[PDB]
Symmetry: D2
Subunit: 251 residues, 4 copies
């Protein structure tokens, strides 16, 4: 209840799914948490539920929204210790010939440039607090995925950008790390499965893709984020896999 007491955390895409799991984990560790989301429904409910969490409406693809998010966080809480760049989207499966440059650009705006913009605007405050950045990437940025060229590209970019930023910010003592989850049961996973010819089969396949035989939970990604923020003081530029072993062995 005190391993990150007194610290201030911003979580983007914090209204549901992995982001909400990360919000809950940080509140339980004593932090004050700003929930950033473009959708009010989940984030407003979480603010009512959790002592120590507040909701700020913010679309991370809009530069002016992000400037306001950072200024409001400082105005309300006086410091900024950790930014968790979790907002992102996985489009439905698309063969390469079905993708468009336009759709690719739109996905880059969210999955990559939104993470870049918030990080850049937060860095002056993180340097003052010797804070840290946690990016949520994906296992498929490392090993690939079928029917997902744009998504995979965006997550390969996030993982690489994490390492570049870690080098740049190391003189200030600011650590920059990423978490690469595998299959985590979230509303996004459910929405994508619902598009498949047999959703039940897709979900079963998703559970069996891991040697541990289940999907991961948002709380498990949340615990990894709290570790990186609060206890991983000699870790920077790492990719922490939270995948249940999916990358291991033949299949």
């Amino acid at each position: 209840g005190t391993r990150y007491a007194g610290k201030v955390v911003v979580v983007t895409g914090g209204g549901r799914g992995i982001g909400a799991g990360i919000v809950r984990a940080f509140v339980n560790s004593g932090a004050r948490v700003v929930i950033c989301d473009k959708d009010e429904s989940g984030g407003r409910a979480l603010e009512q539920e959790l002592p120590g969490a507040v909701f700020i409406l913010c679309d991370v693809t809009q530069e002016d929204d992000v400037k306001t998010l950072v200024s409001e966080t400082i105005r309300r809480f006086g410091r900024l210790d950790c930014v968790v760049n979790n907002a992102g989207h996985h489009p439905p499966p698309q063969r390469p010939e079905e993708t468009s440059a336009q759709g690719f650009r739109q996905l880059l705006e969210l999955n990559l440039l939104g993470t870049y913009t918030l990080t850049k605007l937060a860095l002056p405050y993180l340097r003052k607090s010797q804070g840290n950045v946690i990016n949520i990437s994906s296992l498929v940025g490392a090993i690939g995925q079928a029917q997902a060229v744009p998504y995979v590209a965006t997550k390969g970019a996030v993982t690489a950008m994490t390492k570049a930023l870690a080098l740049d910010e190391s003189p200030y003592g600011v650590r920059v790390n990423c978490i690469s989850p595998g299959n985590i049961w979230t509303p996004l996973w459910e929405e994508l499965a619902a598009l498949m010819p047999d959703p039940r089969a897709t979900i079963r396949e998703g559970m069996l893709a891991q040697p541990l035989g289940r999907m991961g939970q948002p709380a498990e990604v949340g615990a990894a984020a709290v570790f990186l923020a609060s206890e991983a003081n000699f870790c920077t530029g790492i990719e922490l896999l939270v995948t249940g072993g999916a990358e291991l062995g033949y299949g």
Copy 2:
């Protein structure tokens, strides 16, 4: 002189540097080569020098230029066997606070989306020939680089996209691989060194960054490309490091 005889190769950014080394390597292996570049000076000279190479002016960031490039290649040579996505740029060193979203988007257009667009438009012809794609990424997409957040992100994206495309195109027998060079002596390396306070020191540091104690040559990247195209028939989705050992050990 015959290991890729009768095949047709498109090399983007083929007018100088690594691209010109790749052009030369494929001509020497018996292929017909289309040199694609936005600058006429180097590419026109190479077309005059090399039997079996032709120059087509094409800016890979302009979709209509790329459509013309592909249609002209088929009209002139009747087939397409290999696309080498080499065109790209490394901006001068920039701290994170010195970068802009605008500059990041422009670099994504060249280093990532140009590679995507040509690949997508070429795939119908590569599927007919059971051809292959070779992307030129960078070691720093894997290990990071200081003062280069946008560049590193773009190359992490290219390496990841290679793996995604390999999965998608495997049913057709089309292989998709990337080469990740380290320090290669090219006009880009020379231009970036010239911006440094002491260019001579920068070049010396660049040579000593490799255990082999020198920078690589364009011809060495070219030989790796010919191997991937002509002899690596069980390789798809790989990242071939051509770095002189730079990623090894402590420094």
Copy 3:
């Protein structure tokens, strides 16, 4: 003080250095800890210092010592939840022509087979508790090191064996992970530096090999071990780098 309360942990090589840091971290998290070491001096003092730690003399290269260690742990505490295979050694720098097959075999016995034997003998008890194994490998197993062929080979083996064991034990819910530290200030680091022509220069070089500009502490490896044991329930077969960024960038 309760994140691993009621659990029983065995730490090999627990009498000094990283191992002692891991012992302390687990005691502080509420666990009962068996300190295994071949040297009495450090381990006996730690047993007197720490409520909840006990010392058992055990050379992990002697199969009968390890059988006794496991049987005594069960007899005294009734369960076994976590094995930390930390015992190991780094010989002085040796060029390849200076190494011997005999010395290589001896190092394999300690760094690899000692980890194998304890793990194998503990698995029946770990399967009953749905416990976990943590192996201490090394960054140099992944990226190499000069003048250390046998050591590097042993640590590459440990990291790979971790992934194999994770696959085998996943049906039982037993997780198997490794930590790969970089430069950590320990008595081993001090002893190796003392052999160098200029120890002070060697230590300075060791601090500057990390972007964070210092060496790591045993407590930092200890915190990573507690995370893997207590909170990383969807992680198996991972390599957690605790290196201060040493593997990033050029040098």
Copy 4:
């Protein structure tokens, strides 16, 4: 027919399987090849079949056999340019509790120490010729395999040792690289499948484990070896995956 003309290559385990594919590839590239094997049947036939290959009976686990192999190679051909450490074995599937320390030591002697001993004894001659070493590791050293703890450990060691040796030998211009094959159809693969309850099913599963939908051929590993020896002059310490994409994606 001339890309490695006039050079002398030693291939261990060259009498069948991948090793014989490597022998054939080097003979076809103009090299003189010493076939080293502990079994006469395949190697003697290959010597009769191939102009430019000779067979020397040698068990790489016996230090005196290896000393003779090196001295005879120099006596007969006057130089040594490339050593290919291919000899190795994969035991039948074994759960961890079914393995023994004794069997693990025996496998280390072959798969790891045999490679070490020949390399060490050859290095004085490779330094004179600015030659190179090619180790045959395995994809499963990188990603794990079930029911194969000892094998996986030995191949993780070989891959890591490759990187260490590359660092040590770089001042002499001697390159050290490894090839990590995936499923390659060889007599070993056939012998292991024959032990399975349904060999036909095991083989079908083995073909479908790769996105390319087939197993690899010895000739394909051979072509990769010739590339590394003859044309990869800026590559040292690399792991070249020859796997058909098996490590990509979910399964």
